[PDB]
Amino acid sequence: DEPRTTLDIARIWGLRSTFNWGSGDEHGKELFNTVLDPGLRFYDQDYEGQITPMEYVTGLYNFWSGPIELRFDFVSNAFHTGTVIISAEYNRSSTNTDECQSHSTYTKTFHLGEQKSVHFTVPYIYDTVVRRNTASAYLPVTDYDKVDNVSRAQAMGIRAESKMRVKVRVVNVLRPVASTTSTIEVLVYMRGGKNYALHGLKQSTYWPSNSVVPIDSFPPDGYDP
Amino acid sequence: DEPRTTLDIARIWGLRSTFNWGSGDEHGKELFNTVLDPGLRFYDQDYEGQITPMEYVTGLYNFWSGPIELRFDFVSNAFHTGTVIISAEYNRSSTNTDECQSHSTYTKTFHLGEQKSVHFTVPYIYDTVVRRNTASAYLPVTDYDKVDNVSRAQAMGIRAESKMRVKVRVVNVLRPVASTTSTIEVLVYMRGGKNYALHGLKQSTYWPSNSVVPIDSFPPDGYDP
Amino acid sequence: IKDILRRPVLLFNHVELDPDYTGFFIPIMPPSRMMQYKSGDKETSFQRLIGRTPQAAIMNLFRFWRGSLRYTIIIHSTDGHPIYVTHVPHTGNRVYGLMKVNNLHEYTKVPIFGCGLTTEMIIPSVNPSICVEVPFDTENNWAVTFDEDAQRNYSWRDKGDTVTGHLVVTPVVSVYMSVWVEAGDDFEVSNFYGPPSVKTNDWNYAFSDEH
Amino acid sequence: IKDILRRPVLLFNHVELDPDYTGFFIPIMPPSRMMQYKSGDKETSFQRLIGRTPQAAIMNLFRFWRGSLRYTIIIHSTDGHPIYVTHVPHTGNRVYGLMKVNNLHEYTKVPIFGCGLTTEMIIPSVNPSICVEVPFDTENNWAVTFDEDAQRNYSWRDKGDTVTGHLVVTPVVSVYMSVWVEAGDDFEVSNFYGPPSVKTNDWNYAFSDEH
Amino acid sequence: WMPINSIRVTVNGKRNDLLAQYYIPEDFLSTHAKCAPNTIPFETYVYGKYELEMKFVANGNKFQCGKVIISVKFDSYQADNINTGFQAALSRPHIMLDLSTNNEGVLKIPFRYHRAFVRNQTHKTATAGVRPGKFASIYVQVLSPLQTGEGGANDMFIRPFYRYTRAEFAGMSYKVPLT
Amino acid sequence: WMPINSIRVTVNGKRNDLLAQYYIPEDFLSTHAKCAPNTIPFETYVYGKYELEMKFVANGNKFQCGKVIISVKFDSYQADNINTGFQAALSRPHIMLDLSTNNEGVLKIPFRYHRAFVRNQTHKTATAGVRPGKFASIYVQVLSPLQTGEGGANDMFIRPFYRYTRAEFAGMSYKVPLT
Amino acid sequence: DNPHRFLPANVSNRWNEYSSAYLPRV
């Protein structure tokens, strides 16, 4: 049952994000919206938290390819009812208020009711056979050095930022009974597809941020109390 | 369809030169005259232009051999009429005014009319099995240094200049109709024969003369505007 | 996983060997969060980039490991002096760097390499580099990869279970060395822990494709 | 064509490696008009005769290339210090010579060879020369051979497609090196462009057979 | 078949002069024949592979004479100003038009690109890191200048026509106006 | 499938009230879903035969209740204001939507027209003697008014979707903007 | 500054490459 390859670890489901869906949310409203890049979660800010297994492992490689799977678990009961539409968008992105632009792409409409979960394979449609990682191959900065344009100019590579997105919009407004909660949380999982690939070993993007202590000489280094 | 060898590139037709043929040109007049040397176009001046594929590739080798093919495309119409004689001359050359000297060698008379093109294989007849290149094997002069006799005396080799020529003379004077042009242009193509050979890799004779810029560090070297 | 772990990871970058000591100790354990640098902590002989290697990232997921490790040691010299690399089995301690064993001030008459333990010599004039394979000479079934706190003073027998022994380098005269480590052919990992809490700031030190 | 391209072409003639930097970068691309010297332009570390080699003349005709290149690196020394040659895959930049990565002033504690990337060491005391084969680790099908203007600031992702990665040489102490390049066994060229506009002045620097 | 803009060849035109040039598919979408039904699938799809066929039809009189060459350069982005002569055209896949006889010529253009697909359209939301809509260049060049008789016509015309022999599209999206 | 404009059903809506109506194909070309790729062939071709399929999806809560009917009238030009009741809808091909259960309904619409073809587009040059782009009418009507509970929602929504099962086109011409 | 960086406006398009309209480049 133990994973043999890096691709086996990428096939483990991991919680990316969470979003709320309420009865106040009008039709065509973006409940969820993100750039699907397993290289970096953000291009414009620091990340700190529990990254998904497929993102963690993709951080070790310079290249990735293949479909990415998603799973939307709705933390609800039987009395909650509504409809959403998941949409994989390519090349160009849609306006936040324009639902019709999202509907034109590769979509799956989910009728929430008794079933409180839906799977979604995101097709890999790019100009290249593989995508290079947005993160760096080698980063010698260890002590949070204040960056300048000269430092950026002398970087390892140039970040090819992805414009490909997945969005979740309201089709039918959530109409739960008065007895139950009006708003529900939706857990967004991700993993690599069955034909997910990785290549080009490099410096890891992610590194432990909690309870990091270097080893000392036991017992010479003041272990005898 | 892509070329696999240097000999495959030498088998591509390439425009050497152009010459005019008019109604004023009397019989026995040299329309065309050149030394057939794929090593160098000129012995007594600089060359700059679009060199033929077979000359470009022959510049990479110290030795060459085999027949050379020619093609004379007459930029004319049906109403143009006349005759020329192509002549491959060996060892000794003919006088410009003496047509009879050119007629004694290996010749092909072409009757211009409906057909506006003629092919001509030049036989390889030399004292040696292969010919060495007239150009240098190694030239360290990069900055157009003003040459002296001491520089020439300390050259890589001695230029064995060829006396073999091809000429095109008027047999019958061009007699076009009054309605059309009196003068026409003739395009002279060349390539290596089916048994054209090359040997002895060396420094290239020819090198790019247009839009030559050396690489710089991207983006360190002032790419950030 | 095994293919990734079998490539070498650079541990020590040009570290001094001193003949006044017993030798430079290397604890037999793979690269992991245990050897990770943190901005502000005390300066060690270890390199700062061990934590961010592919293998270290993999070994953070598995808390068990069994089998042999391979150590590529390069002596920065071209002298005819022999530099000895002695293998110590699992005794129960965990140390690194230069150490005087039993705090003596003389070790030429009582060398660790001439005590009885398994030893191999490097002759820099012939070859300054060597690759040595250390066995799994321990009482335990598995060797523990990492702990939550490496510097915590807990039960002393359990404290030493993170290593399977030591590798001690002893010179004749003062000389520097560099050390790599990799997994052997006979090597396994188990006890999958899953991914930990992590941080990154790679975005900040690079331009986008739109200038 | 393949036979011609597989012979070595000398790139750098006795160029300095400095340990204050990360290392001497070599962009993974074959010889061509891109590395051609022009009389008057700024002086580079590259040799002047790369443009006039047989292989460079061939590569000017083909704008696509796929497969591996082989780099013969000679370190001008007989010391016991290890000089590391690290392979970087296609990241999207294009640089050469000595460079401080992220403009730091210390790289012994954070070496490029001990980050995780594929690396090979040279030990001049044993052998000052090495021959290393770099793979085709890129997203694109073909690598672009040349551009019309090498120094033009155009779309940044397309700008880096002329290389498939880098080869970084890092010393211990200050030392010089010389570098050749050739095509690998697994290597192809395509996208035939035909002959460009050219010039020569070889006639002028030689006597004729008639004095 | 879909016709594109007319080409004028004059007596003033010298050898090596560009009569016309086309960056494809870009120029067949948003400059030449913009209202063609050939351009409809490019509105919705973002990627594609494209193999073309280009016919050329000349109409010069019997008392005129001259030569024109049309060639193709595969993956020509930031390499249009080099290997761009009559000699480079004669080397690469090409056709030759005699201006007196009025012989037709057909260029069969395969897909030879350094990526798997070529991007169809630019967009405000889309990245500027990849310049789209260009996998090749076509050049129409003078090989031998046009000549004419006494009191003759000082120019004559050529008309190109294009068609996709194999146009596969990929990555469906919302429809957009072309450039 | 291509979605068209949303329909709002309120408690105020009485029996026999038109919620929406569609003159087809006209209204699917130049009002509803104008940027759809379904509308691309209508630009070039002047005539055609058209068999459609229209799916309807309702979303009312369990404490609501009501009935909606959708029907089709073939060749409805100058006969939309007669035989246009709930009773006429029940007679003609139709579907019935219960607003509580949220059952889906599909209308299979054949081509039944007094001519061979229907004209696709009007034009300045084209005749005004024949009114084009209308071979049928679709009606969405209230059968039983929407009702709700105490402090409940006073409205709920229905979404139509259309597709051509058999769209044959005839008479090619230059491309024009739709209406 | 470096003249290769940016093309003059008359010969080039918006993307900073030789315009297709500008025939005289050859």
TrEMBL record, chains C, D:
<protein>
    <recommendedName>
        <fullName>Genome polyprotein</fullName>
    </recommendedName>
</protein>
TrEMBL record, chains E, F:
<protein>
    <recommendedName>
        <fullName>Genome polyprotein</fullName>
    </recommendedName>
</protein>
From TrEMBL, chain G:
<protein>
    <submittedName>
        <fullName>Structural protein Vp1</fullName>
    </submittedName>
</protein>
